[PDB]
Design a binder for this molecule. Structure first.
Ligand SMILES: C[N+](C)(C)CCO
Length: 128
């Protein structure tokens, strides 16, 4: 599965771009978790953080969540509570992988950690 030359595999934290929406954090999942069908070649199934729904998204419309400051949308973040909730669950998942520990208020330092480049592991720590 996902043997098509393009990147991103199961478990990868990514940003996903759907028409009409900001880049949104997601996890790449196997089609078996979706209750649907296999993804077409060059597509990935993702599960979106925040609402837990599934979309078949092209790999050209995905980037690693580690490319954070370049895809984090600050306007959308200020405008939409769903996007903030999405960011929380995405970064929380990121934190546990990277073995990072912290002391809306919970978000603030995870956001800073993410925006600052996921110190000290860097993006390496975000891998599944
Ligand atoms: C995460 N999006 C809002 C882009 C789609 C949710 O199903």
């Amino acid at each position: 599965e996902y043997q098509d030359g393009k990147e991103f595999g199961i478990g990868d934290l990514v940003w996903g771009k759907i028409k009409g929406f900001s880049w949104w954090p997601a996890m790449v999942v196997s089609w078996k978790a979706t209750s649907k069908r296999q993804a077409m070649s060059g597509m990935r199934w993702v599960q979106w953080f925040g609402d837990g729904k599934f979309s078949e998204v092209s790999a050209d419309k995905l980037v690693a969540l580690g490319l954070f400051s370049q895809h984090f949308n600050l306007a959308t973040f200020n405008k939409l509570v769903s996007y903030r909730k999405a960011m929380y669950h995405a970064l929380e998942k990121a934190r546990v992988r990277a073995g990072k520990t912290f002391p809306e208020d919970q978000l603030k330092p995870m956001l800073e950690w993410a925006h600052g480049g996921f110190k000290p592991t860097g993006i390496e720590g975000l891998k599944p």
